[PDB]
Structure formats: structure tokens, C-alpha cells
Amino acid sequence: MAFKLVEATYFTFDKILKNTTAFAPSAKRFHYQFNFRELARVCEGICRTTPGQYSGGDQGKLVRLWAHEMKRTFEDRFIANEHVEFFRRYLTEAISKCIGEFPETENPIAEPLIFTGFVAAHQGLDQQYTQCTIPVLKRVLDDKLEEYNEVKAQMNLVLFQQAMEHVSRICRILDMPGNNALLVGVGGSGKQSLCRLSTFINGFEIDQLVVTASFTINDLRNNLQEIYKKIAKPNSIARVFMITDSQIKEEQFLIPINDMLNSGWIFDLFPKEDMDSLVSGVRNEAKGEGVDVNNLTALTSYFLDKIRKNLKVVLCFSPVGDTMRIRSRKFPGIINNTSIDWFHPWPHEALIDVAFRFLEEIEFPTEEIRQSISLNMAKVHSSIDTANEKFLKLERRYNYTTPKSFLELIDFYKKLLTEKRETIQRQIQRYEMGL
Amino acid sequence: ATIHTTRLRYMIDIHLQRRKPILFIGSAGTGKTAVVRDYLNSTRPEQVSHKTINFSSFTDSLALQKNIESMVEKKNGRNYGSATNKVLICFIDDFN
Amino acid sequence: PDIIEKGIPITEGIEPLKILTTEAIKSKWKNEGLPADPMSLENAAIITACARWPLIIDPQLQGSTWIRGKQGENLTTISLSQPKWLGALTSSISSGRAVLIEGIQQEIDATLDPLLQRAVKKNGNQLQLEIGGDPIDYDPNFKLFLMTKLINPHFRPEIAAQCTIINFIVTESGLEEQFIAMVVNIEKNELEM
Ligand SMILES: Nc1ncnc2c1ncn2[C@@H]1O[C@H](COP(=O)(O)OP(=O)(O)O)[C@@H](O)[C@H]1O
Ligand SMILES: Nc1ncnc2c1ncn2[C@@H]1O[C@H](COP(=O)(O)OP(=O)(O)O)[C@@H](O)[C@H]1O
Ligand SMILES: [Mg+2]
Ligand SMILES: [Mg+2]
């Protein structure tokens, strides 16, 4: 089955290269470029699977896992839902060729099918990565969110199916050692808040830099420098690093971060004498590991491996201008080294759940109004995107509609309705007393 | 190891004995950096002394010299080279 | 139609102009250099009910003249080009009825980004908003209006969400409707009065 999966992953990879018109390097396809790394991390994530849980018949269970993992490094690469459809057809043809005979009852690849090694940690399984059902995922995330609210700063979110899937595939990139996560989406997509949650789900400690109005390159270096002191110590939880487009006030602040995220740590971050004192602390660990000590070559190397494993870099950009594309062109490390993750707009089914959550704890005549309003809230936002597509073709004037725009609209509507209802109630009470 | 890497691996050993530098070209996917990075580990740390340099598109000529200065030890006179006749290798990535 | 299909309790004849604002306040606006066409009333009705800061697009400065009429007292217009615009805005945020920003066509300055955000930080009784190096004391009933003179202006979609966009452009039938209201007042003055 291993050999078949290698020919399969190639077959899918090869059918995409053949369709140069569909997928190619472009201005808006700076990342679309298909490397070894995406095949490598696919091959890496199979190696993550422990023997004891995958022991037995691997005719049904492996192809599912592979297909998922394959899908999550290719879907995120694609921006358009058209490109997605083309890929799924190539993936089915590829599987059906190498496997030969497979049941038509259950599609090998399916949107419902997710794989995560955080669900295992909740159920008391140790280093286990398997397929998790949508309803099980809901219960774990909802429980963990209550734990996050208890200790860290309270974050409200809808926790719809598509947002939860986005939590799963970020948790997955953080579980892989050395590999860095890149989140791309429009302003308000929840990605920064989904990352902070996703980090907390796993056993990792998130550290975001705070940018003041007046900031300097040397001030950034000192914030990073502090983070590397916590990683250097042997018995340390792996530090995640959070960055957004707003946090990057100038392009000079990005240069250090890319050299960190590419490999090891930025050249001449600390002095040579300070580096020597960090190396000595790691030497005590190396004895326990059983790696060659007092070699001063393999040890220094081992220090760079540990630092790489314990530093995770999370980047957040918006693909709205050609400024992000200029970042890709300028900064080579970012697009190739990190694992891209693209946020699509919220589905019609998800928007209904958002409205249904905000309408809760508001009085209504029969609460059937609530369930209907929640539909109309989704229908109105969708009908704007269809009108916005019509507006883009008809006139040169560009309008943009984001999920934060939608959230803020709902809060304003709710406040206006509550104020009008309160005024009407006061007037009716006065009229009743007078009567 | 691959058929393609082993034959390039031989070409590097040939090109390391000589003072002739090597330049690798190909797409992002091809896996050049790793093939060089494997070799630098397999080389003896006394004979050859390896260092990686990565340009992020803001690396000025002055900043490159600071990286070279640190790599090269101070020989007798104006000349700067490694002590005990060690050969100094500087690896460059994202050259263009 | 989609409100009737669901069957949600609503009045038989709804129009957005009536909800946003009463009839009397439309008659006030008419006096303050506004036309009687519904498109301009809708636009004027939006900025009143806006939960976000309103970015206005005004070729022929039709919107700007209305804003100046409405804000009769303590209105200050500060262009991006002015060198003390950071210092003026900070002193305005503390004790300013209203603020107007000229130009700001596209690429909005990073110093305004925290102000543009409707979320404000409350320190005890007082409210504090962080603009520039030093935080400045925020007072309630502060208004911020952003006017931009352009045709097909291009904004960041993150900004189009953050700040509600509204256009005062007199085009097609939109200008016709204004001339009718003007003509009617000259022709049948008695009926309008
Ligand atoms: N699913 C959601 N449910 C509720 N509120 C949300 C949701 N997603 C985002 N938000 C709100 O909108 C904000 C979006 O900002 P952020 O999470 O940083 O995303 P982005 O980087 O796309 O702007 C959140 O901080 C939160 O206040
Ligand atoms: N034998 C190999 N095993 C694993 N990865 C390899 C191997 N050979 C090359 N690679 C890949 O090579 C890449 C690093 O070198 P290279 O592709 O030249 O880098 P770049 O694309 O930045 O020029 C990584 O994707 C790495 O996985
Ligand atoms: Mg945000
Ligand atoms: Mg490389």
C-alpha cells in the first residue's frame, strides 16, 4: 500500500503540472507553486501515525488518512472553488488507478473527514493521530474553549463547522516539528483568534509582540531575544510566535522574522559569549539524550535542532492588495518554508449559526422569528456578495464585504431593535397606567 | 540518496578539492539547499568549516561583509584566512 | 420579498428612509444645503444611524456642504497634508463636537487605525483611546467624518469592513430627482409651503 500511495501522490501532483492553464506561477498564484515540501510533510504526517492504532487491515484506514493529509496541503494552496473541484477529480482518478478496486459506497475523500492528534489527548490516548467525527470535534472544542476563557483573556466565537475545520488543520501544522504555519484571509476572518485557540488546544505557549506607535528594529530584536531565552532552557514548552499585518508597521521588522522562521535563529541576534552560555545549558540535556558531548560541532548543531523544534512562527496577512504579493517576491523564506492556509468566506450554513448565537438572550413572540431571522441574516449577506459581483462587472467601483463587517452589522441591528422595543414598551406601560 | 544526488555529490567533492566555486539552479520544489546541507554535515569539521547565509531581499553588501568577517579568522599581516590551513566554505541561498 | 416568505411581523409598507429618520429631520436637512432626491436622504439617514465611522465619497463636494450645514458649531476640517494634523486630532478627540478629514483618498495612515476601530478602552470612570506615542483622553458624543474627492476610489477590504462606506455622487436619474424638487419649488411654491 506504501508504493501505491507514492505513485498516487505523484499521479495527482503530475496531473496538476500537466494542466498549466489551470495551475501555474502568476501574480495572484505566487504560492500555487507545487514543491517537494508539500509531498514531504504529507510523507511526514503518515510517519506521525503510531503502529498500535493502525495495526490490522489498512485497505480502508490508510487511504482515508493519506487523502485527508494530501487534501489539506493542496486545498489551502488553492484560492478559487473551481481549482478545488479540478483537484478532487484528479485525486479520485489517482486513488482508483493505484488501488485498482475500491468501494463506491463511501467516497475515499469527503469534506466531513478530518484527522487530528489533539482529540486523542482529550480521550486520554498518547501520541495518537486518527479520523475524528464532526460531532466528537464539537464537544472537545466547546469544552476546551471554557478552559481557555477561565485562565487566558475571554474570546467569543461562533464555532461553526468550517471555523472548527480551520482550527483542526492549524493544530495539525503546530503538531508537526520544525514546520511553520501561514494564515491568509480577508479582514475579520477570525484567524488570529482561531490561532490563539488552536495553540491553547495543543500544549504550546503563544507569545505575540506588542507594537507601540514609535517602534525601532533594536526594540523588536530585544522582544525576540527574550523569547529565545525561554526556548534555550531544556525543560521548556515550545513557544509559538504570532504576527499580523498591523503588527508589521514597516517592512524592516519582517527581515529578522523570516531568517528565524527559515532555519534556526537570525544571524547575530545575541553576542558569541552569550551563545556559549546557552550551549552549556543544552549540554546537560545532550548527556540524557545520549548524543556526542564535548564535540562542539554536533552539540552546537543539536542546539539549532532543539531551537527549531521549540520555536513555531505564525504569520497572518490579507490577500487584498499586491503588497502581500510584493512580500512573497521580496521575502523568499515566507512562502516556501511555512505551510500556507487560505480562509474562504463563511458559508451560507455557517452565517445562519452566527445569527442564531447573537439572537439568543433577546425576547421574541414565539422564538420561530429567531430561527427565520437567522436565515434572512445569511440570505442578506450572500445577496450582497452576488450584487457585489454584479457591481464589479457593471461599474469599475469595487465594494468589499468581510465576516467582521457582517458581525458588526448584526450587533448594530440588535442594538437598534432593542432600543426601539424598550421605547415602545415604556410608552405602552404609561398608556396602560393612564387607561 | 538518489541517482541524481550521488552524481552531483561526486561533482561537489571534485569542486571542493579545487578552489572552483559551485552554483545550483532549479525551481523552488527541486530540493537543492537540502542536497548541499547534507554534504556540509558529512564533511569533516577540521578539514572544512561550513556556514549558511540567506538573503531576504534587504541584505546590503555591508551586511554580507559582516557575515564573511566573522567567518574568516585574522591571519598574519593584512591577509585574512583560517588558522592551521583549514579551507573556508560560505554557502549562499536565494542568490538572485 | 424574503421577509414576507418567512412571515416575520412587519408593517405592510416599509421604506428605509422612514425607519432611519423621521419626516421632521428630513425637512431640517433640506434647509442645510441637501437636495430632496431620496438617494441623498438615504445617504444622510445612513450617517445618522452608522455604528461605524462613515467614509464619504464626494465629487462636486455635495456631501461636504451638507456635513458643514448639520455640524453648525465646533466643526473642524483637517486635511492629511497639514503637518499638525496628528496634534490637532488628539486635541480634537479630547473636546471636539465633530471632526472632518479632507483628502485621505486611499492608503489610510496607521495613526488613524486605532481611532477608526469602534472598540475603546475604559479606565475606571474615564474612557482612554490610544493614538500615537502618548494615549489621549476620549470623551463621549465625539463624531468623525472622512470625506474623499475621487471617481472609482479603491480601499482596503479590511478598511471597508472596519469603516462603513457611503457615496454622495450626483449621477444619472440621481441628479434628475434633485432638479425636479428644485423646479417644483419655483413652479408650485404654494403647494410645497
Ligand atoms: N467566528 C467568529 N465569531 C465571533 N466573532 C468573531 C468570529 N471571527 C472573528 N470574530 C471577531 O472579529 C475579530 C476578527 O479579528 P481577528 O480574529 O484578528 O481576525 P483578522 O486577522 O482576520 O482580522 C475577532 O477578534 C472577533 O472579535
Ligand atoms: N532526500 C530528500 N529527503 C527529503 N527532502 C528532500 C530531499 N532532497 C531534497 N529535499 C527537499 O529539498 C528542499 C530543500 O532544498 P531545496 O529544495 O533545494 O530548497 P529551495 O526550494 O529553497 O531551493 C526541502 O523541501 C526538502 O524536503
Ligand atoms: Mg483583527
Ligand atoms: Mg531552500
PDB file of N, CA and C in Angstrom, chain C residues 89-160:
ATOM      1  N   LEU C  89      -5.938  66.504  15.804  1.00  0.00           N
ATOM      2  CA  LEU C  89      -6.869  65.361  16.011  1.00  0.00           C
ATOM      3  C   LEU C  89      -6.888  64.963  17.493  1.00  0.00           C
ATOM      4  N   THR C  90      -5.710  64.826  18.117  1.00  0.00           N
ATOM      5  CA  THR C  90      -5.534  64.446  19.548  1.00  0.00           C
ATOM      6  C   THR C  90      -6.263  65.462  20.439  1.00  0.00           C
ATOM      7  N   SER C  91      -6.025  66.761  20.222  1.00  0.00           N
ATOM      8  CA  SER C  91      -6.685  67.890  20.937  1.00  0.00           C
ATOM      9  C   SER C  91      -8.186  67.933  20.611  1.00  0.00           C
ATOM     10  N   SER C  92      -8.583  67.482  19.414  1.00  0.00           N
ATOM     11  CA  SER C  92      -9.996  67.406  18.956  1.00  0.00           C
ATOM     12  C   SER C  92     -10.722  66.238  19.640  1.00  0.00           C
ATOM     13  N   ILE C  93     -10.107  65.047  19.692  1.00  0.00           N
ATOM     14  CA  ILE C  93     -10.692  63.813  20.313  1.00  0.00           C
ATOM     15  C   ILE C  93     -11.103  64.113  21.763  1.00  0.00           C
ATOM     16  N   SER C  94     -10.261  64.837  22.511  1.00  0.00           N
ATOM     17  CA  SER C  94     -10.459  65.178  23.945  1.00  0.00           C
ATOM     18  C   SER C  94     -11.736  66.008  24.124  1.00  0.00           C
ATOM     19  N   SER C  95     -11.865  67.118  23.391  1.00  0.00           N
ATOM     20  CA  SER C  95     -13.028  68.044  23.453  1.00  0.00           C
ATOM     21  C   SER C  95     -13.324  68.606  22.058  1.00  0.00           C
ATOM     22  N   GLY C  96     -13.950  67.784  21.209  1.00  0.00           N
ATOM     23  CA  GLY C  96     -14.432  68.160  19.867  1.00  0.00           C
ATOM     24  C   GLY C  96     -15.834  67.633  19.631  1.00  0.00           C
ATOM     25  N   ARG C  97     -16.769  68.527  19.294  1.00  0.00           N
ATOM     26  CA  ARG C  97     -18.149  68.184  18.857  1.00  0.00           C
ATOM     27  C   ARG C  97     -18.044  67.205  17.683  1.00  0.00           C
ATOM     28  N   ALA C  98     -17.364  67.623  16.611  1.00  0.00           N
ATOM     29  CA  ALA C  98     -17.166  66.841  15.369  1.00  0.00           C
ATOM     30  C   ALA C  98     -15.778  67.113  14.777  1.00  0.00           C
ATOM     31  N   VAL C  99     -15.305  66.180  13.946  1.00  0.00           N
ATOM     32  CA  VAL C  99     -14.023  66.250  13.183  1.00  0.00           C
ATOM     33  C   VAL C  99     -14.311  65.834  11.737  1.00  0.00           C
ATOM     34  N   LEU C 100     -13.710  66.533  10.768  1.00  0.00           N
ATOM     35  CA  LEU C 100     -13.771  66.199   9.319  1.00  0.00           C
ATOM     36  C   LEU C 100     -12.338  66.074   8.785  1.00  0.00           C
ATOM     37  N   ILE C 101     -12.058  65.016   8.014  1.00  0.00           N
ATOM     38  CA  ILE C 101     -10.717  64.729   7.422  1.00  0.00           C
ATOM     39  C   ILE C 101     -10.819  64.849   5.897  1.00  0.00           C
ATOM     40  N   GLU C 102     -10.120  65.833   5.315  1.00  0.00           N
ATOM     41  CA  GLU C 102     -10.065  66.090   3.847  1.00  0.00           C
ATOM     42  C   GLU C 102      -8.999  65.198   3.201  1.00  0.00           C
ATOM     43  N   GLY C 103      -9.129  64.955   1.893  1.00  0.00           N
ATOM     44  CA  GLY C 103      -8.218  64.106   1.102  1.00  0.00           C
ATOM     45  C   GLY C 103      -8.408  62.633   1.426  1.00  0.00           C
ATOM     46  N   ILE C 104      -7.461  62.048   2.174  1.00  0.00           N
ATOM     47  CA  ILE C 104      -7.403  60.616   2.615  1.00  0.00           C
ATOM     48  C   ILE C 104      -8.078  59.717   1.566  1.00  0.00           C
ATOM     49  N   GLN C 105      -7.605  59.815   0.321  1.00  0.00           N
ATOM     50  CA  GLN C 105      -8.187  59.161  -0.883  1.00  0.00           C
ATOM     51  C   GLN C 105      -8.057  57.637  -0.768  1.00  0.00           C
ATOM     52  N   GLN C 106      -6.873  57.162  -0.379  1.00  0.00           N
ATOM     53  CA  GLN C 106      -6.539  55.719  -0.238  1.00  0.00           C
ATOM     54  C   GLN C 106      -5.184  55.606   0.468  1.00  0.00           C
ATOM     55  N   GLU C 107      -4.863  54.418   0.997  1.00  0.00           N
ATOM     56  CA  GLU C 107      -3.723  54.165   1.922  1.00  0.00           C
ATOM     57  C   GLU C 107      -3.906  55.059   3.157  1.00  0.00           C
ATOM     58  N   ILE C 108      -4.771  54.632   4.085  1.00  0.00           N
ATOM     59  CA  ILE C 108      -5.146  55.403   5.311  1.00  0.00           C
ATOM     60  C   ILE C 108      -4.008  55.229   6.323  1.00  0.00           C
ATOM     61  N   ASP C 109      -3.581  56.319   6.973  1.00  0.00           N
ATOM     62  CA  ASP C 109      -2.389  56.357   7.867  1.00  0.00           C
ATOM     63  C   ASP C 109      -2.607  55.433   9.072  1.00  0.00           C
ATOM     64  N   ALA C 110      -1.528  54.781   9.522  1.00  0.00           N
ATOM     65  CA  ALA C 110      -1.502  53.777  10.616  1.00  0.00           C
ATOM     66  C   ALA C 110      -1.898  54.415  11.954  1.00  0.00           C
ATOM     67  N   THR C 111      -1.682  55.726  12.114  1.00  0.00           N
ATOM     68  CA  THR C 111      -2.020  56.507  13.335  1.00  0.00           C
ATOM     69  C   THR C 111      -3.544  56.579  13.526  1.00  0.00           C
ATOM     70  N   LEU C 112      -4.319  56.569  12.435  1.00  0.00           N
ATOM     71  CA  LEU C 112      -5.809  56.642  12.468  1.00  0.00           C
ATOM     72  C   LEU C 112      -6.421  55.258  12.732  1.00  0.00           C
ATOM     73  N   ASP C 113      -5.680  54.167  12.497  1.00  0.00           N
ATOM     74  CA  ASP C 113      -6.208  52.771  12.534  1.00  0.00           C
ATOM     75  C   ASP C 113      -6.803  52.457  13.908  1.00  0.00           C
ATOM     76  N   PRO C 114      -6.133  52.772  15.046  1.00  0.00           N
ATOM     77  CA  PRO C 114      -6.738  52.604  16.371  1.00  0.00           C
ATOM     78  C   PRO C 114      -7.985  53.472  16.619  1.00  0.00           C
ATOM     79  N   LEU C 115      -8.007  54.695  16.078  1.00  0.00           N
ATOM     80  CA  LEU C 115      -9.171  55.623  16.159  1.00  0.00           C
ATOM     81  C   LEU C 115     -10.337  55.034  15.352  1.00  0.00           C
ATOM     82  N   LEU C 116     -10.078  54.619  14.104  1.00  0.00           N
ATOM     83  CA  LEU C 116     -11.083  54.026  13.176  1.00  0.00           C
ATOM     84  C   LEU C 116     -11.811  52.858  13.857  1.00  0.00           C
ATOM     85  N   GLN C 117     -11.101  52.056  14.663  1.00  0.00           N
ATOM     86  CA  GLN C 117     -11.679  50.931  15.449  1.00  0.00           C
ATOM     87  C   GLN C 117     -12.677  51.495  16.465  1.00  0.00           C
ATOM     88  N   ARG C 118     -13.919  50.998  16.439  1.00  0.00           N
ATOM     89  CA  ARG C 118     -15.033  51.492  17.291  1.00  0.00           C
ATOM     90  C   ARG C 118     -14.833  51.049  18.745  1.00  0.00           C
ATOM     91  N   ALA C 119     -14.056  49.984  18.982  1.00  0.00           N
ATOM     92  CA  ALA C 119     -13.693  49.493  20.334  1.00  0.00           C
ATOM     93  C   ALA C 119     -12.785  50.519  21.022  1.00  0.00           C
ATOM     94  N   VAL C 120     -13.183  50.967  22.220  1.00  0.00           N
ATOM     95  CA  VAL C 120     -12.453  51.946  23.081  1.00  0.00           C
ATOM     96  C   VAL C 120     -12.216  51.294  24.450  1.00  0.00           C
ATOM     97  N   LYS C 121     -11.119  51.655  25.126  1.00  0.00           N
ATOM     98  CA  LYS C 121     -10.697  51.091  26.440  1.00  0.00           C
ATOM     99  C   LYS C 121     -11.151  52.031  27.564  1.00  0.00           C
ATOM    100  N   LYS C 122     -11.865  51.498  28.564  1.00  0.00           N
ATOM    101  CA  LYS C 122     -12.487  52.277  29.671  1.00  0.00           C
ATOM    102  C   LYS C 122     -11.652  52.067  30.942  1.00  0.00           C
ATOM    103  N   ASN C 123     -10.982  53.123  31.419  1.00  0.00           N
ATOM    104  CA  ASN C 123     -10.118  53.114  32.632  1.00  0.00           C
ATOM    105  C   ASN C 123     -10.873  53.799  33.779  1.00  0.00           C
ATOM    106  N   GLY C 124     -11.590  53.011  34.589  1.00  0.00           N
ATOM    107  CA  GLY C 124     -12.448  53.497  35.687  1.00  0.00           C
ATOM    108  C   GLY C 124     -13.674  54.220  35.153  1.00  0.00           C
ATOM    109  N   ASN C 125     -13.850  55.491  35.529  1.00  0.00           N
ATOM    110  CA  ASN C 125     -14.957  56.372  35.059  1.00  0.00           C
ATOM    111  C   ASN C 125     -14.650  56.857  33.639  1.00  0.00           C
ATOM    112  N   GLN C 126     -13.408  57.296  33.403  1.00  0.00           N
ATOM    113  CA  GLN C 126     -12.938  57.885  32.117  1.00  0.00           C
ATOM    114  C   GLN C 126     -12.760  56.785  31.064  1.00  0.00           C
ATOM    115  N   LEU C 127     -12.778  57.181  29.787  1.00  0.00           N
ATOM    116  CA  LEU C 127     -12.531  56.313  28.603  1.00  0.00           C
ATOM    117  C   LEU C 127     -11.253  56.802  27.908  1.00  0.00           C
ATOM    118  N   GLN C 128     -10.313  55.889  27.622  1.00  0.00           N
ATOM    119  CA  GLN C 128      -8.969  56.195  27.058  1.00  0.00           C
ATOM    120  C   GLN C 128      -8.809  55.495  25.699  1.00  0.00           C
ATOM    121  N   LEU C 129      -8.470  56.260  24.654  1.00  0.00           N
ATOM    122  CA  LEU C 129      -8.199  55.759  23.280  1.00  0.00           C
ATOM    123  C   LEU C 129      -6.735  56.057  22.934  1.00  0.00           C
ATOM    124  N   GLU C 130      -5.994  55.046  22.463  1.00  0.00           N
ATOM    125  CA  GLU C 130      -4.527  55.117  22.210  1.00  0.00           C
ATOM    126  C   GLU C 130      -4.270  55.513  20.750  1.00  0.00           C
ATOM    127  N   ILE C 131      -3.885  56.774  20.520  1.00  0.00           N
ATOM    128  CA  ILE C 131      -3.462  57.327  19.196  1.00  0.00           C
ATOM    129  C   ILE C 131      -2.059  57.918  19.350  1.00  0.00           C
ATOM    130  N   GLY C 132      -1.125  57.521  18.481  1.00  0.00           N
ATOM    131  CA  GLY C 132       0.288  57.945  18.537  1.00  0.00           C
ATOM    132  C   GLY C 132       0.989  57.399  19.771  1.00  0.00           C
ATOM    133  N   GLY C 133       2.125  58.002  20.140  1.00  0.00           N
ATOM    134  CA  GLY C 133       3.004  57.555  21.242  1.00  0.00           C
ATOM    135  C   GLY C 133       2.313  57.625  22.594  1.00  0.00           C
ATOM    136  N   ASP C 134       1.713  58.778  22.916  1.00  0.00           N
ATOM    137  CA  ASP C 134       1.006  59.052  24.199  1.00  0.00           C
ATOM    138  C   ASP C 134      -0.490  58.807  24.009  1.00  0.00           C
ATOM    139  N   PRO C 135      -1.161  58.005  24.876  1.00  0.00           N
ATOM    140  CA  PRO C 135      -2.623  57.898  24.856  1.00  0.00           C
ATOM    141  C   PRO C 135      -3.323  59.222  25.200  1.00  0.00           C
ATOM    142  N   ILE C 136      -4.460  59.496  24.548  1.00  0.00           N
ATOM    143  CA  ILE C 136      -5.270  60.743  24.710  1.00  0.00           C
ATOM    144  C   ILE C 136      -6.632  60.372  25.308  1.00  0.00           C
ATOM    145  N   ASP C 137      -7.154  61.219  26.204  1.00  0.00           N
ATOM    146  CA  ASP C 137      -8.458  61.023  26.893  1.00  0.00           C
ATOM    147  C   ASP C 137      -9.584  61.159  25.861  1.00  0.00           C
ATOM    148  N   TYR C 138     -10.469  60.158  25.781  1.00  0.00           N
ATOM    149  CA  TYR C 138     -11.641  60.102  24.864  1.00  0.00           C
ATOM    150  C   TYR C 138     -12.886  60.585  25.617  1.00  0.00           C
ATOM    151  N   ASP C 139     -13.679  61.462  24.991  1.00  0.00           N
ATOM    152  CA  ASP C 139     -14.963  61.981  25.539  1.00  0.00           C
ATOM    153  C   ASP C 139     -16.124  61.411  24.725  1.00  0.00           C
ATOM    154  N   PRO C 140     -17.318  61.197  25.330  1.00  0.00           N
ATOM    155  CA  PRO C 140     -18.495  60.758  24.580  1.00  0.00           C
ATOM    156  C   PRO C 140     -19.050  61.864  23.670  1.00  0.00           C
ATOM    157  N   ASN C 141     -19.917  61.478  22.729  1.00  0.00           N
ATOM    158  CA  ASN C 141     -20.535  62.361  21.701  1.00  0.00           C
ATOM    159  C   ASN C 141     -19.438  63.029  20.859  1.00  0.00           C
ATOM    160  N   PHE C 142     -18.331  62.318  20.614  1.00  0.00           N
ATOM    161  CA  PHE C 142     -17.316  62.659  19.585  1.00  0.00           C
ATOM    162  C   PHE C 142     -17.788  62.062  18.256  1.00  0.00           C
ATOM    163  N   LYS C 143     -17.711  62.840  17.171  1.00  0.00           N
ATOM    164  CA  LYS C 143     -18.047  62.392  15.793  1.00  0.00           C
ATOM    165  C   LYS C 143     -16.819  62.577  14.900  1.00  0.00           C
ATOM    166  N   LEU C 144     -16.618  61.640  13.970  1.00  0.00           N
ATOM    167  CA  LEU C 144     -15.519  61.632  12.974  1.00  0.00           C
ATOM    168  C   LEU C 144     -16.130  61.364  11.595  1.00  0.00           C
ATOM    169  N   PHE C 145     -15.912  62.276  10.643  1.00  0.00           N
ATOM    170  CA  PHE C 145     -16.375  62.188   9.234  1.00  0.00           C
ATOM    171  C   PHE C 145     -15.147  62.211   8.318  1.00  0.00           C
ATOM    172  N   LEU C 146     -15.065  61.262   7.378  1.00  0.00           N
ATOM    173  CA  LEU C 146     -13.961  61.146   6.386  1.00  0.00           C
ATOM    174  C   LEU C 146     -14.537  61.406   4.990  1.00  0.00           C
ATOM    175  N   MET C 147     -14.228  62.564   4.396  1.00  0.00           N
ATOM    176  CA  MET C 147     -14.616  62.925   3.004  1.00  0.00           C
ATOM    177  C   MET C 147     -13.412  62.691   2.082  1.00  0.00           C
ATOM    178  N   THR C 148     -13.654  62.145   0.882  1.00  0.00           N
ATOM    179  CA  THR C 148     -12.628  61.862  -0.161  1.00  0.00           C
ATOM    180  C   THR C 148     -13.184  62.228  -1.543  1.00  0.00           C
ATOM    181  N   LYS C 149     -12.493  63.110  -2.269  1.00  0.00           N
ATOM    182  CA  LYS C 149     -12.856  63.527  -3.649  1.00  0.00           C
ATOM    183  C   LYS C 149     -12.178  62.563  -4.625  1.00  0.00           C
ATOM    184  N   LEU C 150     -12.907  61.554  -5.108  1.00  0.00           N
ATOM    185  CA  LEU C 150     -12.412  60.616  -6.151  1.00  0.00           C
ATOM    186  C   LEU C 150     -13.585  60.037  -6.955  1.00  0.00           C
ATOM    187  N   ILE C 151     -13.253  59.496  -8.129  1.00  0.00           N
ATOM    188  CA  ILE C 151     -14.144  58.711  -9.032  1.00  0.00           C
ATOM    189  C   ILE C 151     -13.576  57.288  -9.069  1.00  0.00           C
ATOM    190  N   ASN C 152     -14.402  56.276  -8.776  1.00  0.00           N
ATOM    191  CA  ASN C 152     -13.972  54.861  -8.604  1.00  0.00           C
ATOM    192  C   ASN C 152     -12.750  54.838  -7.681  1.00  0.00           C
ATOM    193  N   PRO C 153     -12.892  55.239  -6.394  1.00  0.00           N
ATOM    194  CA  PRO C 153     -11.808  55.108  -5.423  1.00  0.00           C
ATOM    195  C   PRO C 153     -11.647  53.654  -4.957  1.00  0.00           C
ATOM    196  N   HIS C 154     -10.405  53.244  -4.681  1.00  0.00           N
ATOM    197  CA  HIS C 154     -10.033  51.866  -4.262  1.00  0.00           C
ATOM    198  C   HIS C 154      -9.554  51.887  -2.809  1.00  0.00           C
ATOM    199  N   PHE C 155     -10.219  51.117  -1.941  1.00  0.00           N
ATOM    200  CA  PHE C 155      -9.909  50.979  -0.496  1.00  0.00           C
ATOM    201  C   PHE C 155      -9.483  49.539  -0.198  1.00  0.00           C
ATOM    202  N   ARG C 156      -8.856  49.341   0.965  1.00  0.00           N
ATOM    203  CA  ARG C 156      -8.550  48.004   1.535  1.00  0.00           C
ATOM    204  C   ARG C 156      -9.863  47.384   2.023  1.00  0.00           C
ATOM    205  N   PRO C 157     -10.153  46.092   1.721  1.00  0.00           N
ATOM    206  CA  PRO C 157     -11.362  45.405   2.200  1.00  0.00           C
ATOM    207  C   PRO C 157     -11.488  45.270   3.726  1.00  0.00           C
ATOM    208  N   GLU C 158     -10.349  45.213   4.426  1.00  0.00           N
ATOM    209  CA  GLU C 158     -10.249  45.260   5.913  1.00  0.00           C
ATOM    210  C   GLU C 158     -10.779  46.609   6.427  1.00  0.00           C
ATOM    211  N   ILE C 159     -10.546  47.690   5.668  1.00  0.00           N
ATOM    212  CA  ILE C 159     -10.965  49.093   5.980  1.00  0.00           C
ATOM    213  C   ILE C 159     -12.450  49.265   5.626  1.00  0.00           C
ATOM    214  N   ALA C 160     -12.898  48.675   4.511  1.00  0.00           N
ATOM    215  CA  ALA C 160     -14.303  48.686   4.026  1.00  0.00           C
ATOM    216  C   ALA C 160     -15.237  47.980   5.022  1.00  0.00           C
TER     217      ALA C 160
END
